[model samples]
Target chain A: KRVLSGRVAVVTGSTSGIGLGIAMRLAMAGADVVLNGRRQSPEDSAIVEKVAAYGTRVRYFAANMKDRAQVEALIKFTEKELGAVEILVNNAGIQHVSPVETFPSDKWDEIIALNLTSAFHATQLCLPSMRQRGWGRIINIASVQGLVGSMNKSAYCAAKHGLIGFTKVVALETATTGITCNAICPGYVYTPLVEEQIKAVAEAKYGGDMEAATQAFLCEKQPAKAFVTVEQVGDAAVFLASPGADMIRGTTITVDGGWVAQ
Target chain B: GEKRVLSGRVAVVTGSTSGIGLGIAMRLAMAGADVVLNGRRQSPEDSAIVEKVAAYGTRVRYFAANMKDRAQVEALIKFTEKELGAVEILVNNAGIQHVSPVETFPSDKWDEIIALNLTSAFHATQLCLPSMRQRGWGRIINIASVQGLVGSMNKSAYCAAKHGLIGFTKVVALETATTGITCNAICPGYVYTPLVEEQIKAVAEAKYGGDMEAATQAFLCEKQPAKAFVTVEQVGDAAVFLASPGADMIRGTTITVDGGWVAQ
Candidate 1:
């Protein structure tokens, strides 16, 4: 039997990158998947079609994670359309880099609003149904930066760190109720994000040599010289939501390539 | 005239006579915090460790307080006020261990362990947070174990208390996010101590046909992904980093010096 048969899973910001990958896995486990992102995302319709191949009822929702009202609305839609979201993967995020002194106030607000507070809104809204069911999973897609810091990433670090802290309180509040909360912290995930970094690194570090630049980038930032795959992330989210991880709570499962170990 | 970065800072670290506590104490002293060393008794042995920490040219004092007692823990806070000043940094490092199955685990041992490891830190932090909040700055570092993040077969009690400690740290961090106080944890994997030299020899002989290096690698492979244990000094460096200005925004999180154990 599939581990997640008939479960309704809501994975946010899943039009592409890690989001799309995670939605595919939830689908594989026989979950009715709700794929969420902005209404204008071009990938949403195509992904919904491919996602249906996993033999689950897959629906796409257009909602801005940054807006509290929109997020709550998305939760309601998920409940009515799919069912009470038994598994929630809060994975939508946006990234920007600038010096704190001149950092755009709007960008900082947006980062904190989407990357951090959105999860809080979703969790608070989704928790009542979870507590009702006595079985639920809330997985926040945090970052290695959540545990540590990087240059020019002030807002991102604070938000991710706050998200980690939020996960802990939720875990304690639900310790006896069977609802579990945790974070999956990944480092240098291979996707469009790393794709851009590779080009930037090639020119900046290796005189336009892509291969050497990518190797040095991983070697310097992430110790294993490897990129954390979304499949690895999907497996982690699945494991955390699985029955086997009933005891795991209020902690993080880091999928870095030994970056933090250094 | 100039001062060390942490020169005016006063640091309190509990259970500093051995292991992780001693390591953190040494590092904190070297960074220039007026170090307060703690243990159950203020003996010459304790004084010796204190002097070792004092070698860094920071003011060092030894304070004795039974961790399980709330009264003594509170007095120790005032004792620091008398010796140096309001504690700018607090490292809750005292701990004990008992091994038993969950069904047979003695109740009192659990109580004692929780009191010493988890609850006392709550008292110390609760006491210190007010001053820290008033001053608009402070740091709280909890010495949680890797078991805090995962489970083991026989360490049910240790795992429970450490996990609870992590939860406490997160809540405190969030509560003080705007108050300029940050609480974080340092999680170390299997540690390498000099006392285990002979133990490694035996493990080598038993597992890798007397090849010390191979046996060491094989053993570390079994537990940690980097296949090497974390040195106490490495853990110390991480604590110092957390307390440093570089980690200003790292709150309610853990810095794992686990040699890639958690990543796997």
Candidate 2:
């Protein structure tokens, strides 16, 4: 259905949540996909089975992304198994929330390594194949927090901003080639991770009165008073990987539902 | 099927003799705004360009003014109202580029580039604000460069001026958000203009024994993934879009037409 029909795509952290959503869309677009996660379990197996139903080859690689050696080996395995990688979706990222002054140093280091440094390693590992193929797509899944700051997410914000800046420089270095690079900055979306945060806030602020605290949280921050759906973010990733986006290099598309409009 | 979008408006574009400025001026003229062209000198070539633009059958005139001169800038604005009409669209497209490493950059060249590229824009905006505020409508588009958004190795002065222009745009937009007027900048990458061609020639002469093609392919296009220079017409189209009614919601923003130069 698209030019990516015979291409092989590698999506990191795709066993669940936003990553799974994006990987599914790529599969629907006709690309064989290799799903990535930190561990292989029943969850990973179910995800692979579900994605395989789309009539595209789907596999899982349980590689610790925080380990650079394992990350490099995973890239090698993908190439050996699926042929040259035609698209790289750097969607693996983790978040930590705490005020900067009191933020844990260990957490800060871990978040930076997972969210930002891992993308660099992955790109470095995958770039040679992309360059040799003369065509490719590198999509970085950044966030709205990357563009604007929040009080409790300094580390995450820093990593995301660094990722955005890194994406720009890489785009400039390879601007004339058929390969394009871009970052997608999505606003708050409803995912299991987000739900966990909501539940914790509810317990803390409302003495376990979940519904009241949930309403208070939504009213205070979200302009739409609702979380952005994972499907919306998935569709945006689909657009970036589509044929129409060939000339759309080194840009960040903000799907924040007017959060930054003011 | 159509109505003049910028009707009853008067637009002034500096450095409108040729290239990107002329392209923008032509787009504004096509959109039903009476246009005024400005250049540093009133030479025969400038006059010919002015006459050619007049063929569009719109009210058009050329003003000779050294935009770097504050007195000339004020007089240019004053003359626009007296001779033709009140200024409605102000496109600060007059800029000069000085390419040199930061350490070896000439002080005078830096000053000239900053004055022509950055300060003159402030002067134009300040001069036109009262009239725009009185009318409760105006549009100011500063022509910035992609260097404003990212760093370049040899164009420190150009980069600083463009970056300052972007900052100035944001402050002005914040100050006048309540008013009908809007201020914005457009960052274009590698437009093939006389100035850029000169830079290419200089590089070719210095590095490749005067082979322009080799130098350009080897150095210039190496950094750009799109492997092509942005067209003047693409810039004209962006200007027209910014000046149109649809872009009213766009405020204090810089639209980069660098072919995803920053997207990677």
Candidate 3:
């Protein structure tokens, strides 16, 4: 039998990037998957189809996680249609890069709403059911920014750090229960969003020499010239959901390739 | 068997009557180092604990000192050296927890918690450093909490103190990087102890209106993904690992024993 056979998993922001990677891993482990994203499009539909190839039931929910109504609805619909969400991965997050003094106020609100506040709502809603059943998993996808600070990206760091704090209190609140919550802090990984950031940096620094700028950017942050893989994060989620991690509680697993080590 | 890395050494662990402090003292004694156990009240039970460690065929002693007092902490270190011999390992494990929101948190409670948890560590470390530097080989393991790494709802003071202790650990590790002395913090998840047991009781009374079972389950199993509370032995294992030769390269780091709480 698959490790997660007979389980139902819901992953937010699963249409692309890290969320999709986590969803695919759960699906491969024999979980019925409910994929969520901001908007329903052909691309979103395609991810559902692709994830179904792992021989598990797959469905998609389109909701803007920044909207509390949508977040509540998303959880309600998932429980009703896809079965109880035994595994909830709070991976729907957005990022903006700006110095603290010059950061946009609106972006700060939006990012916090999506990254930190949404997880709180989802956890509150999903918890009673999980507690009743005596088993569940909540994984908050934080970032390296949660553990350490960067020169820019104040909002991202604050939200992620808040997420880490939230995970700890929640963990303590349910320390003896079957359901557990933890945050995963990953370093720079190769993803579409990160690629876009690399392109933006390249343009800003090299005046359109994208390739050279990308190399310089990677060199500065990842001196080892290696990026954390999406699959590595997926594996970490699986471990948290596994029986071996039964004693693990409120923690941040750093998947940064020695970035924070230095 | 491997060589005795800490052979001919003597270590003192404060608040060693039970829990993480007792666990570290046992490990140090097992590692061929003489051990001195200190507790706030020098009870007959403290003597029992010392005798239990003495069963391992190592010298063991007990000291009664309140870690919250600066002079007492200094005396405790001096006593370890004078009575047991030069102190080679110092594990600052004495701590207490108070739970309340920031605004409502008691002022005296905050000061006492900070004094014992944070400042006592500083006092103990500063007092021990001179002799350790003279010996040219020493280890200081601070038993911080996961609260040091993250904040909690009703533990603002506890979090700040633990966080401050972690910051101190980092600074000392950096300062002693090239020296034979190593300073590190062990951030354990929720291990069952008298203090945490009290927290469980408080949470139960507050959250479930006296439904202790429901409050407890809500506090432990539902929120923690590992579905289990970390045991004191697991934390002791981590301390032994840190004290091993393998951990020599591991410096200025906090090894978390919370069943991957932060690892999503």
Error of 1 at B187 (Å): 10
DockQ of 3: 0.10
> lDDT by residue for model 2 over A120-153, one digit each (tens)?
9998888888898788888898987788887899
Which model is ahead, 1 or 2, in terms of DockQ? 2
lDDT (10s digit) by residue, model 3, range A1-262: 7878878888999888889888888888788889998988867767888889899889888998878889889888987887888999999559899888889999999989899999998888889999999998888999888988888888888999999999888877776677777777877777899888888887787888877876777667543345666766776677567654455567765665444545
Q: Which ranges in model 1 have alpha carbons more than 4 Å from their true place?
A: A203-207, B1-264
Stretches of model 2 off by over 4 angstroms after superposition: A1-144, A152-174, A177-248, A252-262, B54-57, B101-104, B260-264
Give lDDT tens digits, candidate 3, residues B150-236: 877888988999999998987787666556677778888778787777888777777777776676556765434455577776676
Between candidates 1 and 3, name the one with more favorable lDDT: 1
Task: Enumerate residue pairs that collide in model 1.
Answer: none
Provide the lDDT at B229 for model 3. Answer: 72
Worst 10 residues of 1 chain A by lDDT: A240-249
Question: Looking at every candidate separately, what fraction of the true A–B Cα contacts under 8 Å does it contain?
Answer: 0.00, 0.30, 0.19
As for TM-score, the candidate ahead, 1 or 3, is 3
Please rank every candidate by DockQ, starting with the best.
2, 3, 1
Query: Which one is best on TM-score?
Result: 2
